[PDB]
Amino acid sequence: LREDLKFYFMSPCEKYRARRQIPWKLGLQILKIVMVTTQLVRFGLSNQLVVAFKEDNTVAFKHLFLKGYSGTDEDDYSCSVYTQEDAYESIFFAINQYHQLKDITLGTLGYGENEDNRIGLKVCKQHYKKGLNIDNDVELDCVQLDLQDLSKKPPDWKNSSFFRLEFYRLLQVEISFHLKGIDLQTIHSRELPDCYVFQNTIIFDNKAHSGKIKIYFDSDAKIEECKDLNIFGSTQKNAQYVLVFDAFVIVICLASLILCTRSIVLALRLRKRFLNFFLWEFINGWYVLVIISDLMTIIGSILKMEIKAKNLTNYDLCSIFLGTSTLLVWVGVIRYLGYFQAYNVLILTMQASLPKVLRFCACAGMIYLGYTFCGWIVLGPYHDKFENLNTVAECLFSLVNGDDMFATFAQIQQKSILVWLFSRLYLYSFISLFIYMILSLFIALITDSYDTIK
Amino acid sequence: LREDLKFYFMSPCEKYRARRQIPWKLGLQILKIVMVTTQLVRFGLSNQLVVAFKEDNTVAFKHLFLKGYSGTDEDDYSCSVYTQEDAYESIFFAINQYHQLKDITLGTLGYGENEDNRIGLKVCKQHYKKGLNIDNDVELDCVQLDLQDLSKKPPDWKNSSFFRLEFYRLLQVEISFHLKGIDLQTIHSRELPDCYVFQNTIIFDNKAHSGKIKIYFDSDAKIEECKDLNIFGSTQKNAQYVLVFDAFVIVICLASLILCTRSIVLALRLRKRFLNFFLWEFINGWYVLVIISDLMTIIGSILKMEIKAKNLTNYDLCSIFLGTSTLLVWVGVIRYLGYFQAYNVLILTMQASLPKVLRFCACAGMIYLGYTFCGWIVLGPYHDKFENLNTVAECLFSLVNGDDMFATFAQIQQKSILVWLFSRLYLYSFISLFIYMILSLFIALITDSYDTIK
Amino acid sequence: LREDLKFYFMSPCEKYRARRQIPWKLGLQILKIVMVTTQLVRFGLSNQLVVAFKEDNTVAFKHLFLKGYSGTDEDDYSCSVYTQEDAYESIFFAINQYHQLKDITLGTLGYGENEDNRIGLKVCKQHYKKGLNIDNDVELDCVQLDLQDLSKKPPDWKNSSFFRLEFYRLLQVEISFHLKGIDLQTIHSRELPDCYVFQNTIIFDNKAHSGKIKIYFDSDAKIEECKDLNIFGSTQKNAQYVLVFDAFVIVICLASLILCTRSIVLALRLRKRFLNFFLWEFINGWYVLVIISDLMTIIGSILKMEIKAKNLTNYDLCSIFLGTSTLLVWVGVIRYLGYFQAYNVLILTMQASLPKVLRFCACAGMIYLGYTFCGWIVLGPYHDKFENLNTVAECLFSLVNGDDMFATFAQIQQKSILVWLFSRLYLYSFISLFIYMILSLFIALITDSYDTIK
Amino acid sequence: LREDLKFYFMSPCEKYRARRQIPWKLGLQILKIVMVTTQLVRFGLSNQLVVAFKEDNTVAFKHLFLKGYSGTDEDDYSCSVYTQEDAYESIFFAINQYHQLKDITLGTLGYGENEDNRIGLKVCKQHYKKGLNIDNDVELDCVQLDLQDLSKKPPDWKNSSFFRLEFYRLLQVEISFHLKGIDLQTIHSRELPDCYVFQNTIIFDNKAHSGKIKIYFDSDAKIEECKDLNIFGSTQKNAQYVLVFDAFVIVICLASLILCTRSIVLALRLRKRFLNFFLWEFINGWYVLVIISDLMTIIGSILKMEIKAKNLTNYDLCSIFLGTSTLLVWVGVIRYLGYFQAYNVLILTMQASLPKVLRFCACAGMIYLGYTFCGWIVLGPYHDKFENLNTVAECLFSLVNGDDMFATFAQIQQKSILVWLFSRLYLYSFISLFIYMILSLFIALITDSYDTIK
Numbered sequence A, B, C, D: 001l002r003e004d005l006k007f008y009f010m011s012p013c014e015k016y017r018a019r020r021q022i023p024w025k026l027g028l029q030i031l032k033i034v035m036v037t038t039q040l041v042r043f044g045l046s047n048q049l050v051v052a053f054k055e056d057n058t059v060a061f062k063h064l065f066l067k068g069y070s071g072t073d074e075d076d077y078s079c080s081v082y083t084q085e086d087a088y089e090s091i092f093f094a095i096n097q098y099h100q101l102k103d104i105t106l107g108t109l110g111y112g113e114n115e116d117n118r119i120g121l122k123v124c125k126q127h128y129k130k131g132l133n134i135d136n137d138v139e140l141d142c143v144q145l146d147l148q149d150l151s152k153k154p155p156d157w158k159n160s161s162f163f164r165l166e167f168y169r170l171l172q173v174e175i176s177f178h179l180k181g182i183d184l185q186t187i188h189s190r191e192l193p194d195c196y197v198f199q200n201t202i203i204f205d206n207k208a209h210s211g212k213i214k215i216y217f218d219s220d221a222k223i224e225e226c227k228d229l230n231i232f233g234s235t236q237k238n239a240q241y242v243l244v245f246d247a248f249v250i251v252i253c254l255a256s257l258i259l260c261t262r263s264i265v266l267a268l269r270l271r272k273r274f275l276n277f278f279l280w281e282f283i284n285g286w287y288v289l290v291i292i293s294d295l296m297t298i299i300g301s302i303l304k305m306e307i308k309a310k311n312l313t314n315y316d317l318c319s320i321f322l323g324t325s326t327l328l329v330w331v332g333v334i335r336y337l338g339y340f341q342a343y344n345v346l347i348l349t350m351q352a353s354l355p356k357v358l359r360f361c362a363c364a365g366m367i368y369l370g371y372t373f374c375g376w377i378v379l380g381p382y383h384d385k386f387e388n389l390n391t392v393a394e395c396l397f398s399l400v401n402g403d404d405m406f407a408t409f410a411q412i413q414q415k416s417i418l419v420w421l422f423s424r425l426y427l428y429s430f431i432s433l434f435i436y437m438i439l440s441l442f443i444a445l446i447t448d449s450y451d452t453i454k
């Protein structure tokens, strides 16, 4: 039993130095680290290319169809108008741009079919029925504008009574159309280009009824088969090319999953044997982390394989899984390196101070929450950094860590002398209090780290 | 007496564990915390909606009536002109916009009556009477421009001699009108919309006589009864809906007010009994804080009820009261949590260091004040962060805490070599001195925290 | 002798408590502090008003005379042009603005006479004589354009051969004129307004010969007697009103100068008497500071009196003197407050650590200088924060104190891979090294502060 | 042997104080420091002048030839267009500007000859041959436009079929021309001006095929003999003027190279003699640094001499060498100053803490790398500070040092609720973890610095 206990606590390198036991587990771990990092890098590069293409196309569309587009979104919406003729001009400009799409576009862009396979432009409007007499119910009417209708020498659609919008009753006007684009940037690699279908919606939203309508542009994009295309170049097989690399990563992490599970079981067996002799110290906390990382890697690889198989363009859950898995993989490198045993005093303090810091954070947290609520309720309407609770929390965290305090002082509005005076008291007290609380903490931590060690 | 003293110092949880005394006071406190937080959140959301509507309407008005409005206020004033024809253009543009208000506005906006119930536009001008011969007295003359006068094919008002402004004598020109607006964004909730009355004043202020006039736009808004309105929807009763919740909050805090007062009296009775036996340690400093929070909550709730009853749109004192009350409520959570007694070393340092830090702040404060005065007097005309004493104080506080020093160095003007050289000496000495003073402080605090504990 | 020594070391408050000696010196010091602070505040407010008026007039002039002025100076120069017709347009626009000055200006502005008392416009140009054949010598020719010449229906001046500028030889074109302005903002206070004379020069400088000319606008302003003015209002006597307050400040500081000098002499007498008994500890270092502050205050008050007497508009040396004097006055408040004697441990560390910090700064300074030189020589042409040595020093100081490091990393140009790679090594090494050096310092300071006290 | 050992450990000043040995080595070192610093300053000033001239000319060219140039590069490219007619307008505007170059330019600029000595304009275009039928191969065709062709009353070139660009197949359009410029700013110093030849290329690059073409402007400049120039002024000899100063610097550092090498050999001889008596402490680590600095200075001086001899305009390797040499020279000043021996406690900690900090950095580095990878993979497409791995590393380093955290929180896109929630967890955990790890480090360092010294 004593021989087994010494062997289980022994480091693999010294296991080979004394017992000549080959540490295949360490090599498997290193291989897993390398494969996970390589897979993450490849996935990141591919996503970078696809996302860059889609965002560039969206920017080009915004420049083409939005009237007087500056080049930067004013907020969550691209642009806004404040006058009836301005809104009319924006709508008519968007419609007229779509008609000459061929003469204007600089890229490989063409007209796309709708759900019922028809090239055209659909515009819908919403109003409260008059029945300022109005009713809560809304009316929705849409008109389909084909390319033939827009091509007519007399536009006609413009003279239609459909466009007489009663802005006082208007809710929103939405313009939707489909476009097909091909990225020739990939043809150089002899890799057959992948056609894209863009579903664009322009929403002239005035739901607020505050005298200003907001123009939203959304461009949903997806990959489609390049039926209408003829290039001297090879097709794509890289799908199956990467399909084996992902499978190998799954197998390697699956092996590491069982291997760590078997080691935990053997540890439990030894503790039972030790307990019989003597009728937390046996469960490595670095094995459960490895198990979690393996599970996350397997899930992320499965999601990536599913995304690649179905030619999906959304990689948010898979990316999160892969990133967390890689982070956990690198903390295991810390574990292995620490085998040197020249890391002790630091580890000790990290265990001694953890309860004290956790107690301090619980106390400081209640002051922080109250300050958050007070700041949001008082400086909410007068400060841009205090508009909502989450923003208040982030601003207070930054202030606690020494960031952007002068901007916080400056961006207040002196239009209200009562609020301005309170803000100075609010900001000065908060910064002074948390500096002092962090002061009283370090000194205590130090005084106690001497009692425990000396 | 000894039994009573042990009971008064005993924690409520252990009181129930040993004496089986139900801690209804703790439950009442928790209930009060929950109600106060909920009330604050509801008030904040309602104020957010109302303030957002009013600010959006103000922005729309600024875009409509101010000529060549960029979209952002140049300062406390919205825009400014430097030429006589520019000022004439701005005034005439504002007047002409008001005439076609219906054809231009995108929201539910209509003309409003003035004090004497008349739809029109009033413009007033101020001049020093010539009597560069001029006098200190000013003359004020106003002309009322009805919609009929503006509707005339020949404007007329423009050809009037009233508009011949002698800019060399001009003080200001003010344009005032009334508008009525309805927010239909609330009709979806079946809640009858609340009509708004906007009092707008456009001031072309050239009081400085510095070759530049400043254009101010102010939009005072208030809620009015929707007489001219017909919507299939229910009226509002939420007034009385919230009127009971505020009353319950008042009752709960009123109960906590007497309960803490009774506890203090009982503590005083026990100290008198203790003093008779033995012919600060008895007044919880966490009871006076609770009493203050209760008073602030009661005052804020009364103010909120008054504001809701009279349909007022200004919530600055009530918001301050509620925020401070919530902050004080959350420090009581610290008090209760601290019952664990595993918080000691920190509390000790916080009492030992308080006199030392207060002494240090008194010394550092006198250097800080002198540096503030010197910076304001020297770098006042050459630095934007040193224009006035309050700004100097805020800038120096930020510099003491490591914020925006490079910007402070850069935003000086090298047009004066004497001031530029002084600023480098001023900034370098200030930062170095306060770093050293904070250095000499931490080391002292630490050396003494050992003498007191060890 | 022992009685005298105890008396000289005794605090004034205890002197009155025991010997009943009235501390008139302390009262005189407090009075001096109050008077100095009040004088500084008054001077600052007056300078603020005058400077604000002059800067507003300069901004108005820039808007009036500079063609296409944005509202903010592009650098040390207001605007710039890159095309010959643009330069011609700017020059002609400036000249034409001056002609209609009356119809355009919004302030009380009129034409001013030149040195020889003549209303007109002088424009000078510089060229290298052709003698690309050219010579180092320059030619200067100027033409005077009176208001009569500009008023002519056919401008004429424009058709003159004087304006045929050979840009390839041009050095600069300068336009100078005089204007007279009155600030009526002061007439409200019944204080007679002070007339101003503006000397404006517009320089079209192309000295660099780099394809871009820089347009400089300078507006020298000075106060003149309001001969052409008639307002129902009183004249100014506040000159003599403040002339007594400054005289009283001089007398008070003169008294404090001799009083501290007499105290030092008495201290020297006591040390000589002490030395005879026993055949730095006697010279308060808080008396030489008071003497320096008194001298600075006297000099600043004399300069302020001279400036007020001669109606000067430049207050840079006097402001510096007054600010430094006020700063030194407030450090004496620290001295007096410290009489409490509860400040000891801090003072001790401040004396123990001073040699150690001075030694550390000498070492860190040599690394800092070398890093400054390397950064200026390498990242000089590729980084805006490393253009010149002073900017490099300020940037490195800010980096040492944790400020704007991410901006420092980002604002480099990747056009050169060699410089970009070096910058990462340069920035990473500098930040890491100085963090470690400050680390090794605090620990040493602390270890030694124990040896000296314990 | 004991006498020799005491002499070798003895400081030069005390060597002269006792043995009267003149420290010519110290004087040689000081001379070397002075010469190196002077050479660096001179080189920096000359490079500043040349670089400023070239950059100003490039800015002028961008303003002249790029249509609608704002004044600041939108990125790595100067400007961009999104419409076919916009691209046509930009190309035609560039060509038309070149034709009237003389009437437009404000500087001494003239037409330059191409490789075959011909004044003209070359424009090349790239397309995939149609053979959306297209092929991977590209076609390149160029047309030479002489000044005579552009001068024709009927432009002609514009009506040519060459300009019919099929944007759907276009790769890029490049316009190249040569210009000759002279800087007359130097003629004042009587120093003959140096003529410059500018090779400018305008690239209308649409390689991305994303609906937006990017316009690149590159201006390669080099010095040429001023054949076409006649100024009354002297030629340049400063080449040989500085050629001796650089030679002297080389000789001085060459002498210091052998002198330090000889000292090391003598140290090795003494250690061998010491070893025979007793049958790291002898190799100054401040001699190898001096040797490295000498080698770097010699290499940099040789490179500078080569650059000056061949009139080259690129100074990036030489500048790096000189800067590193100067930095190493200033660390030797630290070495000499340290002879005072009042620097001990600091040096001690710097040796005691180095292993502990190196161990801590190895551990913190693995967490930092994992966080870098996770941030790049997750927040890559949604945050501008996480676009690529290097940017992620710089952002995380800045966050570790307290910089721009609030901006990091704010610049995320809430369009994805999953990514937004992860970012808050990602940022909060990273900042909290590294603060705690740095916390647990300082306390450990301090506890151990007591064990080693006390």
Ligand SMILES: Clc1cccc(Cl)c1C1=NO[C@H]2[C@@H]3CC[C@@H](C3)[C@@H]12
Residues within 6 Å of the ligand: A360, A361, A362, A364, A365, A368, A397, A400, A401, A434, A438, D431, D432, D435
């Ligand atoms: Cl994580 C951290 C980093 C830097 C400084 C501080 Cl004060 C902290 C905190 N310790 O306690 C909590 C309390 C809740 C967010 C703050 C306040 C947090």
Ligand SMILES: Clc1cccc(Cl)c1C1=NO[C@H]2[C@@H]3CC[C@@H](C3)[C@@H]12
Residues within 6 Å of the ligand: A431, A432, A435, B360, B361, B362, B364, B365, B368, B397, B400, B401, B434, B438
């Ligand atoms: Cl609150 C604080 C936070 C961070 C750093 C410092 Cl130095 C302080 C201060 N301690 O003393 C006072 C003195 C008056 C405002 C400054 C200077 C203040």
Ligand SMILES: Clc1cccc(Cl)c1C1=NO[C@H]2[C@@H]3CC[C@@H](C3)[C@@H]12
Residues within 6 Å of the ligand: B431, B432, B435, C360, C361, C362, C364, C365, C368, C397, C400, C401, C434, C438
């Ligand atoms: Cl003043 C100061 C404040 C904060 C941090 C530091 Cl490192 C310092 C310095 N101590 O040494 C000198 C050296 C010369 C300017 C820096 C480097 C200065």
Ligand SMILES: Clc1cccc(Cl)c1C1=NO[C@H]2[C@@H]3CC[C@@H](C3)[C@@H]12
Residues within 6 Å of the ligand: C431, C432, C435, D360, D361, D362, D364, D365, D368, D397, D400, D401, D434, D438
């Ligand atoms: Cl250099 C430094 C300065 C300030 C704060 C810290 Cl945490 C450091 C580091 N110590 O460990 C490494 C790890 C790799 C870059 C960071 C993380 C670095």
